[PDB]
């Protein structure tokens, strides 16, 4: 809806070209970063517990709660800050490169940031683009210049764009000559593939040429130009409105199933850290009830504290028994669980097995967050054409007028013309050595293999397409006759319609309207009396498992053309809903076509596309298939794909059974309850259509007693493999939703190949884009990508699992690490006068959560395979089933806890009984209370670690160095901190505690035991699980 | 083409320990052979240590010195008879327990100024704001400020041996070397410089409750100021209500006589420390010492309760597995 002028002068009101990819700045970093952290629960809560320590008079010095909180920040800010600064220095490059402009007959050399909207740009070969231009001319005629979008969506070929006819003449011919134009384009939409515009070039005196535009004229900002000398563009979008720049945002998907549990535990602890306070406050003011039991003449209450309002004092305590138990919320989890993902996401991008030789590229992880979401999928929505069958079509066994050509020249000769026209082959322009090859270079470059196999087909017969020469088309009809054809309108294909067409003008006569498309969408518009003659053939060729396509021509009368022509073009200059308003202009152009003959193309399966789908099943998933081809075809490739065993009682809902409005439901409820409700197991699979489906969902609001849909969905959950044929481009989305929104939240993993699937990949929990032959429209939106389908096995099982059992046993341990460390300090608030006397020291309250026992859980997080990565992908029986999120469900969670409590108690009561002795050393001396801290601590750091050394089932050389590299650290720290660190301290309370807690040979036997009795409830499950 | 490094492929050189029943069952039967030979190894050296705790708190209408449980002339004098059945062989230690004396009380553990006792001259004249309730009396600085050092257990015990005649032989007690040598020469030091331990304390005074200045706790210069063992061992907090702190140790005479010959003795305690107020008892635990420490059964009954409940499930496991 905007407006532009080539030279900015007609016959700043717009954005400025400076791409700022960053989020922070050099000034608002802190006030932004911090807030974006302290809005998180555990990083904010620990803040409150800081203030409360700086104002109130509380037991533990502010250090033991501000350091382990100032650190976890400074180590996230830096990374989360620096990791950003990479962009600035990156950005500054792109938008500070040289790009010449044309002010007034001048080839100025400005900075790419200086460009404004509506101004001529210049570009040599090999150079990136300054912004979204509109190709206006090139050095040569033909107004053509290829492009290689190798940085926007990852494409690696040389697409070819087009210039504007009325301007191709302009090349160095001072286009600056107040060149008139009006470039109206829809406000920048990030679709990156649609572009509706217009030009209103003005001639010398008067001219209003309404030269419509299109995506074939836009040159994105970042598509390296190739195979040309130079061009001249007219900027339309100028950065931060350009199509590319808009595509930095996809974050509305990273809500894993292991990121809310982490929020269902805290909400528990935050509701346990109170009980631990309330239950331990009341007991105090009920204990102090005794008159002498407080300040019994040997600790006289400081006079001031005596005259304090009781109720108030009843507060400062309850605020003390949070500052004293606050450690019961893991402070350093919001750095590990992130440092893990970052340092441990590449693994899905390096694994060699995700590397096809041909495509000469590997896997690609376009989301560093959904990793853990792979060992969760419960529905897998594959796509038949493109994933299950590579796009290498081979035209075989056509059928003209039901005669199955191998009629002579009355209509057949025409048919061939149909095959060779009405397409977008665009044969390889360059010429190679012809005479040694079969025919010539003759390499066809197109996106829809459904036709590239046709042309190659006709090439096996007389006719052959070799043209598109200067607005015409060339063909060889069994002899030496170029036979130029004048192309007039190439009606692009559109899935929602299933028909592409071409309106050519017979070089020496009238016009023609060729067209092709799926039978179910070409037959409705035909001289019906000819359908049955060829219908049976299209059945067999499909019944056997070949793609099918019908083709028919309709001669137009010239007197009728002008109506169409006008009606056609005028249906383009519309800037609002062009594709729709256009689609509908020629949807009534294919009124009645004289069908000529049908065609059949065969397809191939992938390497293991038949072995994988035999694995997934064994893994518990419920694989679906959302094809678009004819029903019969899908039913054929399915058997081969091996998702329909020999004995499977299908429940088809095809048009061949539901040719009515009400009939289906009758058939629906029958094969649901009386057929699949009264009851190897796989005996039943489903099959639907693009029509039979829409009736169900859209028209469900009638039988509110037993709604159609609510019935239909019921069958889904109870069918291990289902099909969907004749699927539109959007109905491949309503399906996902219709499933995602039922009985919980089944994690739906969809997998597409091309543009058709963009409507679900962007919709399912975790897409999987297969970068195949069509294009990267699918692999650029998908969270991940794998240049095959055989990889979707090694992806889900061998990674989706480890990327779960590597965290499920982190968010668990990272809590159980604390609920033990802070249990004693709660019991020891029983054998003290409830005066909140921290059992441990302070030097052992900061360290323990960042230094003593931080790494050993990180190590086990990045690199570990509790089941060898080979035995896990070579055995999908349950290893993708044993974890249906069960690793964090309410069952296991409160086992660890009821493992902390026990392993917690034994720490204290295990020690208490040990200090009924009156001495432990041999010299007979006594042991203070601090020596009651290190004991019940040194017996802690040796359990919360060893309890790991009983879980790591994959001992690399790192684990050996971390675990035994924290313990042999602790036993050193206490030795150093123990010794002389006096000068700046104020207590010298742990001056020699440790060194004496080890010279008592009768102490180890308490440690060496208290460890065991704490692990003995873990050494058992091993036995009770390795026995059966 | 992709990096075939040992790590990135995610197949680093592993250990892969196969933890299975058939290879873990011995895990039970390997300890049972190694704990029990300790659980019993210790339990022997526990019941072979004789002790005695002569509760002399009072509160007993028939208690020999209830007479001064109530406020009487300061220098009270108790006398308690008691009989030793099995004479003590080694060198015996004499503790002095307590009870319901919450020496671990956050409001009572902060009550020491650790940087003063260390001998920091400047810190002396003006102790911290932690030993508040007993910081300055008569607006003056206190040398061992703070409740902890204030309420220093201040009654003198004594043990007499009654021979055949009625004259009781006095048993010789020793007091030096009853505190961790680590925190008796490093963590507690007198004021910076001086010659007589009095001058060094110029502006300070004695605590409130005490009866004599810190520079008069003992004549022996090696034990007088802030070094008094009695004082030191009273500062390291109790670590529990029911505690007991070393008081004096009897060095085993070189001869081959029993350091404590059996029979009845006399224990006359100069009762000064009153604990009847908070309902706290008092005692005097005599004891020997073995490498394990002091008589304590737990370690014994624990090992033998683990070294014989792990070594049993293995049976119920070994027998259950083969029968399936
Ligand atoms: N050049 C062309 N000529 C005739 N028909 C065409 C065509 N290009 C596409 N079609 C029609 O478009 C339909 C595309 O099928 P649909 O997209 O529903 O499933 P699909 O098999 O193409 C899986 P995918 O979308 O991944 O390629 C085909 O049925 C075909 O008839
Ligand atoms: C020994 O210490 C105890 C501590 O309670 C004390 O009761 C004894 O008598 C105290 O003397 C202090 C004054 O010199 C002072 O604490 C108080 O007068 C008196 N006790 C009371 C009731 O406070 C101390 N005895 C000795 C030997 O001084
Ligand atoms: C204990 O003290 C008393 C105090 O009278 C004194 O006679 C003697 O030293 C000891 N024995 C007796 C007789 O009490």
XYZ file of C-alpha atoms and ligand atoms in Angstrom, chain B residues 77-79 160 168 266 268, ligand 3:
21
model
C 31.990 -27.829 99.661
C 30.486 -31.106 98.477
C 31.804 -34.603 99.141
C 40.894 -38.480 96.888
C 42.543 -40.266 101.906
C 36.028 -39.109 97.755
C 34.692 -32.975 97.054
C 37.258 -32.681 100.478
O 37.031 -31.372 101.009
C 36.860 -31.407 102.423
C 36.213 -30.114 102.897
O 35.853 -30.253 104.274
C 38.205 -31.639 103.096
O 37.995 -32.164 104.410
C 39.059 -32.607 102.289
O 39.982 -31.843 101.503
C 38.213 -33.488 101.370
N 37.543 -34.566 102.087
C 36.604 -34.382 103.007
C 36.949 -34.872 104.384
O 35.538 -33.849 102.742
